[PDB]
Amino acid sequence: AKATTSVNYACNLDKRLPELPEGANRAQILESTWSTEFKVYDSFGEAHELQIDFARVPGEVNAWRATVNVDPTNADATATRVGIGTTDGVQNSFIVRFDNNGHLASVTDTAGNVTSPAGQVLVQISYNVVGANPDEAGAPTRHTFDVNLGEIGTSKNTITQFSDKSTTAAYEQDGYT
């Protein structure tokens, strides 16, 4: 068995889901949310469910907050963190923004770290491996990996926001049980 180090991931987020004003209520946000999940694998032979809820940002166009939890039924114990170039100083969500043709434009984490204006977009993910021994210095053992969301400004194997069903467009990775 061996661990996920990188996930080649892409999806479409349905542009037809209504844009939200700043004051939107919980149900309006849920109507403009798409939730999905895929598997990642730690170094110890266990598959973990990674859930992402993509919800439009109230008050901003072409912008979605992705909230990530590994082991979503035990999410406080895994303490999932997501960031651009880091998993320190951040929580578990990022905002993905699209350009006026629906192509990926930027990703920003909760500390405000943002992707470069061009190129490949990698989101760093880490979470606690529940039940594992700590590492050799006593820090809790975490599984860290990246999610490649594709190339800014392009559609192939890249997250998109087109007027079509929300769906997974690509998923492959290098971990297994």
Question: Quick one: tokens of 55?
Answer: 């919800």
79-115 core/surface letters (b: 16 or more CB in 10 A; e: else) = bbbbbbeebeebebbbbbbbeeebbbbbbbbbeebeb
Resolution of this model in Å is 1.5
Angle 155-153-86 from CA coordinates, rounded to 5°: 100
Experimentally determined by: X-ray
Please state the domain extents for the chain.
1-177
- Give CA–CA dist 29/7, Å, rounded: 27
The three-state secondary structure class of 36 is strand
